[PDB]
Every structure is written in C-alpha cells, then in structure tokens.
Design a protein around this ligand. Structure first.
Ligand SMILES: *[C@@H]1O[C@H](CO)[C@@H](O)[C@H](O)[C@H]1NC(C)=O
Ligand SMILES: *[C@@H]1O[C@H](CO)[C@@H](O)[C@H](O)[C@H]1NC(C)=O
Ligand SMILES: *[C@@H]1O[C@H](CO)[C@@H](O)[C@H](O)[C@H]1NC(C)=O
Lengths: 100, 434
C-alpha cells in the first residue's frame, strides 16, 4: 500500500496509479472512495499481430518484451541451426561427386 | 453431504458453487463473505502522556544544613542549595545571613487531561479471523459467523460449516503498536523501564490511576539567581508532544490489502488477502429427488456481445429442451468466468439469457444447465472504461489471459521453428544414409 499523504492548498491536479488490486483515496473529511483498474489497454488482442503486440505491451511490458525476445531468439536459433544442418548435408552429399 | 470448496477472502463478490448428490438433483450453493475481522491478542505494556512536572514548595532550613533522601515518586530530582537568602514578600525568610540552605524538589506526574489524551503501548501477537458468511442453499438464505482457525462449528440450524486455515496470514499490525485516541500507529516503543528524555515513553505507568509511575525526563535543578523563593528548573521536552508532532500517518491510512482499523478491541476489518477453505455439511432437507426435478434434454449456449471487465459484461443465451416444469440451477465450471444468476425457471424447449463476468479475452467455458454440461466459446473485447467502481469478480490466469488468436500465432511461429528443426534432422538422416 504505497500510501501518499499530502496537505493541498488551492485548485490543483494530482495523478495516482490504479491497478487491478485497486486504489482508495480519502479527500478531507469525505468518506473513502475506492476505485479499480481494469484491463483497458489500447489495441485489439483479437485482430492483427501489431495490435496484439501493442495491447499486450501496454498490459504487461516486461512479459511482452521477453516473450517477443523469446520468439525472435527461437526463430533465429532454429533457422541458423537448420541452415547449418542443410549445409552439412549439402557438402556431405556433394563431396562424393567432388572427389571424382 | 459434506462439500469442500475454497472461497476468496474478499468481502463482497458473492461466490458460486454447485453441489451434486448422486441420487439427488444438483443444487445451488452461494457463499458470500459479508464481513471479516482480524482480532489479535494484545496486552497492555504501559500508558504514556504528558507530565505535570509538579514542583513542591521549597524546604528552606537555616543555621545549619539538610540533605534530602531518595523517593519512589516519578523522576525524583533533588538538590541542596547552600549560601542562599530567601526573600519572600515581607522580607528575609530566615536570619542566618549567608549560610542559609534551601531544598528544591522536582518530580513528574500525569497531566489532568491524560484521561483522554493518552497513548497505550501494546504488543500484538498472531491474529484469529472471524468471518461472517451468507449461505444461500435450496432457495434459503442463512446468516452466520464463524472462526477461521479450523474445526469450529459456529453456525446454527442444520448448517454445519467449518472454515479451514488462512492460506497466508499477513497480520497488518506489527509486533509493537501504539493506540492514541482511536488511531493506531506502528511504533517501536521502548520497553518498560527503558526510557529516553525527549522521546516516546518518557513517562511510564501500568494505568492512568496507578501509583507506580516511572520516568527519566532530563529534569535538573538550578541555583536561584534572584533573591526569591522560586525553584528554577530546566527539563527536556515531553516525548508525547515530540511523537505527536512527527507520528506520521496511522494504520487507517497505511494498511496493506485495504482494510480498516478499529479500537476496543483492536481489529482490522474487511481484509482481502487470501482464500478460506469451507466445508459444509448441507442438510438433506434442501436436496430434492432427481425424478421430481425437471431435467433438460439438449442445450447449446450462443453468447453475444462479450466484453471482459470487472462488471457482468456478458450475455449468453441457452436453448433448453426441458420436459417437466420447475427450476434447477446454472453454474459456470471455469475459474475464469462466473455467472450471475443461480436458478432459472425452465418450461419446455425455450430460451433463457444469463450474464457472466470474465477476465480472459476468450470465453471458452462450460455452463451446466441443471446438471447437463455444455461448453461454448466467445471472442470478448476489452472494456472502454479505464477505471471501474467495483472490484473484479475473477482473477487473471496466465493460460487464459492469452487470446486464442495470439495463441495461434505464438504456436504458429513455435511450431514452424520446431518442424523446421525436424526437417533439418531428417535431412541429416537422409545425408547419413548416403
Ligand atoms: C497526469 O497524467 C496525465 C494522463 O496520464 C498526463 O497528461 C498529465 O501530464 C499528468 N500530470 C502530471 C502533473 O504529471
Ligand atoms: C424455493 O422457493 C421457490 C419460490 O418460492 C420455489 O419455486 C422452489 O420450489 C423452492 N425450492 C425449494 C428447494 O424448496
Ligand atoms: C511539527 O514540528 C515542526 C518543527 O519541529 C513544525 O515546523 C511543525 O509546524 C509542527 N507541526 C506539524 C503538524 O508538522
């Protein structure tokens, strides 16, 4: 509970970060007001991949950057390894016709 | 029937369940945690407040000298001043010229308004949870209040309920707390007998009307400069005022999991930090025979306009082919989607509508009208409202939070890479045969 207490004079504007857990604010002698944040990130998770990418990046940034990093690393490693395998097979099958 | 389940600790958000005896029709079970309170075992270490620092009348003795003994009064500081000349109204108070001796006394004692403006220092041990439960079964609503520590049938009527242990008790109060005027603070107050001048606990007593009061204020007695009969003293500032100036904020504004602190007794009510296992020995009076319950024949849910949010942003319609007349319940069997109604009256071959809350982009879930299960799918949309006024009905699941389409491209890229590895290895095999 990142409790912030401030004495406020005059007409100002204050920014607070609400999560799915919720945030409760008390303003003067008023009764406490509790609010909750729901997953309303911009984009559509059901449309094109770029909209899904920006939506899930706005939802959870570290998980999204690490899963796209995993996808990129996995496809790069797979293509490199299978290119090495194809080159191995190519030169192995081309050397009996290369000695003769 | 003994039914075991696990309900969230969150006050409000009523919880759905479906009990199914073998020889009886399925029956609703609605568990609502209407209230809760963590009441820890506390003991009074001491009470502290202002000091009156009463100074008695000086004892001037003359043509000689006197010495003062120690006393059991709180913070007894005593000094003897020689070579004085006490001069009250009317002249010199004795006749021994510049050999006169004066005794000056000083001790502290509780202020007259310490009955209200006082701070009680308490040690807080582990806390036992009360939970008030509203149980709706078999069209009947019952209110009850039980312990959570385990094996405590504190319910009434024919409902026996047992609340299992808390998954992880969090104990919002620290080991040491200070209660002043209905406000609770987490302060590491010094122990009984341990006391500093100008700090909290400068004066100490078991009660406000206790003779045994102990204090160590930095009080000290000074030689009277002016020829009068005053007692000049300098004393350290009260630690009560110093702590009041910089107490910070109380527990009512600094508390994890959003639950409010009350006094007499010290409690933290409506705490939302886990799950309670509930075992219910539901009676057989609410159970109805399967033959007398109107069973359905074939259903299929076709949801329209799903929006996954904290509210009930769903509307699925069921197409029932029931045979007899009456009502018999509904229940969503997924941990990600929770229905709104409990029972629905079914006539024959008709259509009903229901509302559900979910947190997943897809709603691929099983709804069991009256016992017979039937799953259906959805393509739900994110909500427009950023901030919403009531808490979420369900919890996000890591498998369900990924949408079906995004799941499809993730397994598409992963399976393309994997099949590319497989074709690489079989190309290696076809190279190895030659
Ligand atoms: C508060 O947040 C809004 C929207 O997030 C932003 O436009 C604004 O600049 C912020 N104000 C301050 C004082 O940081
Ligand atoms: C509960 O009451 C409702 C409406 O009053 C009735 O239709 C139903 O038969 C009752 N259910 C049970 C299990 O007694
Ligand atoms: C507390 O004391 C400080 C300095 O000792 C003073 O400035 C302040 O006005 C006092 N009161 C509060 C409420 O902070």
């Amino acid at each position: 509970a990142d409790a912030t207490a401030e004495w406020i004079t005059g007409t100002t504007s204050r920014n607070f970060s609400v999560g799915r857990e919720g945030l409760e604010y008390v303003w003067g002698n008023h009764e406490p007001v509790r609010v909750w944040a729901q997953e309303s990130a911009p984009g559509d998770p059901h449309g094109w991949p770029h909209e899904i990418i920006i939506h899930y990046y706005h939802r959870h940034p570290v998980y999204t950057v690490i899963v796209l990093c995993g996808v990129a690393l996995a496809i790069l490693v797979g293509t490199a390894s299978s290119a090495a395998c194809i080159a191995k097979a190519r030169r192995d099958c081309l050397t009996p016709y290369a000695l003769a | 029937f003994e039914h075991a389940t696990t309900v969230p600790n969150v006050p409000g958000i009523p919880y759905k369940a479906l009990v199914e005896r073998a020889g009886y029709a399925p029956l609703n079970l609605e568990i609502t945690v209407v209230s809760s309170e963590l009441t820890p075992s506390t003991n009074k270490e001491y009470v502290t407040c202002k000091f009156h620092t009463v100074v008695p009348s000086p004892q001037v003795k003359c043509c000689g000298s006197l010495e003062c003994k120690a006393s059991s009064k709180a913070d007894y500081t005593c000094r003897v001043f020689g070579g004085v000349y006490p001069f009250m109204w009317g002249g010199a108070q004795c006749f021994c010229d510049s050999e006169n001796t004066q005794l000056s006394e000083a001790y502290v004692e509780f202020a007259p308004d310490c009955t209200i403006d006082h701070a009680v220092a308490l040690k807080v041990h582990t806390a036992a949870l009360k939970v008030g439960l509203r149980i709706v079964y078999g069209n009947t609503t019952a209110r009850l209040d039980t312990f959570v520590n385990g094996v405590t049938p504190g319910s009434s009527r024919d409902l026996k309920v047992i609340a299992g242990p808390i998954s992880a008790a969090f104990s919002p109060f620290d080991h040491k707390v200070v209660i002043r005027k209905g406000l609770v603070y987490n302060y590491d107050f010094p122990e009984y007998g341990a006391m500093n001048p100008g700090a909290f606990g400068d004066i100490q007593a078991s009660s406000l009307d206790a003779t045994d009061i102990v204090a160590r204020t930095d009080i000290r007695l000074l030689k009277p400069s002016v020829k009068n009969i005053h007692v000049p003293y300098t004393q350290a500032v009260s630690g009560y005022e110093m702590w009041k100036n910089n107490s910070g904020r109380p527990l009512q504004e600094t508390a994890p999991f959003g639950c409010k602190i009350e006094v007499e007794p010290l409690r933290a009510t409506n705490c939302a930090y886990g799950h309670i296992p509930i075992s219910i020995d539901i009676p057989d009076a609410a159970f109805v025979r399967s033959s007398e319950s109107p069973t359905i024949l074939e259903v299929s849910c076709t949801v329209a306009d799903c929006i996954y949010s904290a509210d009930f942003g769903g509307s699925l319609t069921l197409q029932y082919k029931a045979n007899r007349e009456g009502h018999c319940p509904v229940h969503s069997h997924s941990t990600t989607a929770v229905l709104k109604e409990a029972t629905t009256h079914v006539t024959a071959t008709g259509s009903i509508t229901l509302h559900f809350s979910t947190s997943s982009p897809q709603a691929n879930f099983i709804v069991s009208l009256c016992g017979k299960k039937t799953t259906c799918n959805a393509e739900c949309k994110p909500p427009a409202d950023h901030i919403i006024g009531e808490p979420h009905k369900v919890d996000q699941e890591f498998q369900a939070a990924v949408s079906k389409t995004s799941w499809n491209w993730l397994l598409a890229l992963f399976g393309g890479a994997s099949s590319l590895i497989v074709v690489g290895l079989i190309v290696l095999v076809c190279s190895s045969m030659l």
